[PDB]
Design goal:
Chain C: It comes from Candida albicans (strain SC5314 / ATCC MYA-2876) (Yeast). Chain C: Belongs to the TUBGCP family. The structure is cut from a larger assembly and holds two copies of chain A, two copies of chain B and one copy of chain D. By secondary structure, chain A is mainly alpha-helical. Chain A is built from twelve helices and two strands; from the N terminus they run ααβααβαααααααα. Helices cover 73% and strands 5% of the residues of chain B. The relative contact order of chain B is 0.10. By secondary structure, chain D is mainly α. In chain D, 55% of the residues lie in helices and 7% in strands. Chain D is built from ten helices and four strands, in the order αβαβααααααββαα. In chain D, α3 (59-74) packs parallel to α5 and α7 (149-158) crosses α8 (172-185). The radius of gyration of chain D is 25 Å and the shape is elongated. The chains are: A mainly alpha, B mainly alpha, D mainly alpha. Chains A and C meet through α1, α2, α5, α6 and α7 of A and α1, α2, α4 and α5 of C. β1 of chain B pairs antiparallel with β3 (197-201) of chain D.
Chain lengths: 255, 37, 100, 243, 31
């Protein structure tokens, strides 16, 4: 497979002083490697893997149909485990931890952007881009750094300006750490008699409802009126009784 | 002897272990959800 | 007290990105180096310098958060701080809190 | 006739060393070498005066050009200007001419002189520019050589009880509290680089009290300048501070 | 003393790596 580049490079060491033989070997290496450069260029410029021969180092793997519903819920493991780096096919240029991480994360970030905003490709932005001319070029690290910075720029602006992450931080603060304690105080007051009873001696399903009347109450808005991010995240939350008590669950990560 | 410094060495190590206990347990729960299907 | 830092940093990052265009242009020269850059063979000796240097020195959060990795790392550190400061991380403190 | 092609590879080694700043010869056939066992920049690279060929000129300038290039493109990580320089001088070695071999000695010396001036100009513009070498040397003298006596008086008055106990008893949190209180009391709280200040205890022996171990440390690790200053100098900066 | 904490840290590094390898094995076999 990709082992040919290693054979040529190993072969080229003995003819390093011979002009004609070195010229021929360099020309052969340049033309042969062009496909690999195409894969790398597409990965770093559009975040898409194309050739199905599993030649490329960044191995994106398909989720089994038997686990599709599971992986859709826990997208973190999808985006952190099913992208890998095939160490066998790496050249000595990429044999560096930070470069591998930069390549993988640049491609993942562009893929996230495309899947989120729905763009098929970045034509609308009409930006001027430079592709990696060769694996033996001296500016490979600079090109990778520039591509990584571009990917971070786009994903950062998506999250902050478009998806309104700063307000999501305040929403998490309120809901989890009680930066506004009025609602949770009403909740405790309303269900004081229930909460102090033993786990099994009280109906679980009632607490859900008595919590939703307090927290996820709603007034609807007309079509075309933008929902607030707080509006979207209010209805997501769910409060449920669990069998793992605080003093038991915290002991693991040390009625 | 190892140099003393203003930053708490044992605190840093302990925080690393706790963060390594959260990753392990979350991974175990996910694998349990994956295996039983 | 811990949340004040993150609030300030995120506000600074929001203001920084508000004025920043989307998409960046990258230019390059003709790169005539050819044989002066190929360096074909096994490898160079420059590999020792990459390992010799260290990149554990990053601070001051200048111009806010610039990489998504730091964005995640800041919140992970904040959560770890909340757990460690609270009396739930040690065994003596947790046991005494549970008894109380 | 044979010497031209026999010497071309040597000039290719010199070309790679001059332009990008890298060493190619795996065998011992060049007057510049490395020392992986060494643990400081200035002495990893050393010259071999016995192996300098007769047909090469301005060798002592080639060595400095290559060393400064390595320093710039691997420690300061200033890849942008290094790439611009690489393109600029490749457009003279390979486009204007056909390599170092196809260059008369006068023009070769002139080219090396131009590269030397440009490289040292940029090295100054970084080290004494963005890094502000003189300001940090002044701060070294200000803190290590006791100049800001108010700060040290604040440390001693605030830590008059912490330093009394043995060096093993003092913990990191107490040191941080002492240092922060002393920074607030004294005039260093308005100092530009107040963040860089950091206290430590060197040898926490049972028989050593706090007064005999406390040392103030000025952190310059965030800059490439720290690689120039070998540990020996810092040790001599901590000895004089102790006295 | 802190040697013991470092030892436990590396042990948990290995355990986490094993768990991730288990996930990869399971997914490869199901495909």
């Amino acid at each position: 497979g990709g082992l040919l580049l290693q054979v040529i490079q190993e072969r080229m060491v003995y003819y390093k002083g011979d002009p004609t033989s070195l010229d021929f070997l360099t020309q052969l290496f340049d033309i042969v490697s062009s496909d690999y450069i195409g894969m790398l260029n597409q990965w770093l410029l559009e975040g898409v893997i194309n050739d199905p021969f599993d030649e490329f180092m960044i191995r994106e793997k398909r989720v089994p149909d038997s686990f599709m519903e599971i992986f859709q819920s826990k997208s973190e493991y999808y985006w952190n485990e099913l992208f890998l780096i095939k160490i066998d096919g790496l050249l000595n240029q990429f044999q560096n931890s930070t470069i591998q991480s930069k390549i993988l994360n640049t491609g993942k970030y562009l893929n996230i952007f495309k899947r989120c905003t729905g763009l098929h490709n970045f034509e609308s932005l009409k930006e001027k881009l430079t592709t990696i001319t060769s694996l033996a070029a001296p500016d490979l690290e600079l090109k990778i750094d520039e591509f990584y910075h571009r990917a971070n720029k786009m994903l950062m602006k998506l999250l902050f300006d478009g998806y309104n992450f700063p307000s999501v931080v305040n929403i998490f603060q309120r809901l989890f750490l009680f930066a506004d304690s009025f609602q949770i105080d009403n909740f405790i007051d309303s269900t004081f008699s229930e909460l102090k009873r033993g786990k099994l001696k009280i109906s679980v399903s009632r607490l859900q409802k008595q919590y939703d009347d307090i927290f996820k109450e709603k007034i609807e808005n007309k079509v075309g009126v933008r929902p607030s991010v707080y509006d979207v995240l209010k209805k997501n939350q769910k409060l449920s009784v669990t069998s793992e008590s605080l003093y038991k669950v915290v002991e693991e990560l040390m009625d | 002897n190892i140099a003393t410094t203003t930053k708490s060495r044992e605190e840093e190590l302990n925080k690393r272990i706790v963060n390594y206990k959260i990753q392990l347990k979350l991974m175990k729960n996910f694998l349990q959800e994956l295996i039983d299907r | 007290h811990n949340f004040e830092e993150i609030k300030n940093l995120i506000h600074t990052t929001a203001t920084n990105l508000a004025t920043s265009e989307l998409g960046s242009d990258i230019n390059d020269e003709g790169d005539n180096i050819f044989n002066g850059s190929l360096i074909r063979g096994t490898f160079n000796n420059n590999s020792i310098f990459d390992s010799k240097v260290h990149k554990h020195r990053t601070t001051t959060y200048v111009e806010g958060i610039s990489t998504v990795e730091q964005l995640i790392q800041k919140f992970l550190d904040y959560s770890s701080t909340l757990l460690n400061d609270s009396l739930l991380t040690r065994e003596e403190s947790l046991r005494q809190l549970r008894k109380m | 006739t044979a010497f031209t092609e026999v010497v071309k590879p040597y000039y290719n080694i010199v070309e790679h060393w001059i332009v990008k700043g890298e060493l190619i010869d795996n065998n011992n056939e060049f007057f510049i070498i490395f020392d992986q066992e060494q643990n400081e920049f200035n002495s990893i690279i050393k010259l071999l005066p016995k192996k300098i060929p007769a047909f090469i000129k301005s060798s002592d300038k080639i060595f400095q050009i290559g060393k400064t290039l390595i320093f710039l493109n691997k420690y300061c990580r200033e890849l942008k200007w290094v790439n611009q320089y690489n393109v600029k001088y490749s457009a003279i070695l390979f486009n204007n001419h056909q390599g170092l071999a196809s260059m008369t000695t006068n023009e070769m010396i002139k080219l090396i002189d131009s590269q030397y001036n440009e490289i040292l100009t940029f090295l100054t513009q970084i080290i004494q520019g963005n890094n502000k070498l003189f300001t940090h040397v002044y701060n070294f003298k200000r803190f290590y050589f006791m100049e800001t006596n108010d700060f040290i008086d604040a440390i001693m008055v605030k830590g008059k009880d912490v330093f009394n106990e043995s060096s093993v008893n003092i913990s990191s949190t107490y040191l941080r509290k002492v240092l922060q209180d002393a920074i607030q009391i004294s005039s260093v709280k308005n100092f530009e680089y107040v963040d860089r200040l950091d206290s430590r205890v060197l040898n926490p022996q049972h028989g050593n009290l706090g007064w005999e171990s406390f040392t103030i440390e000025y952190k310059i690790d965030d800059l490439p300048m720290s690689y120039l200053f070998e540990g020996h100098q810092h040790l001599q900066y901590l000895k004089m501070f102790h006295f």
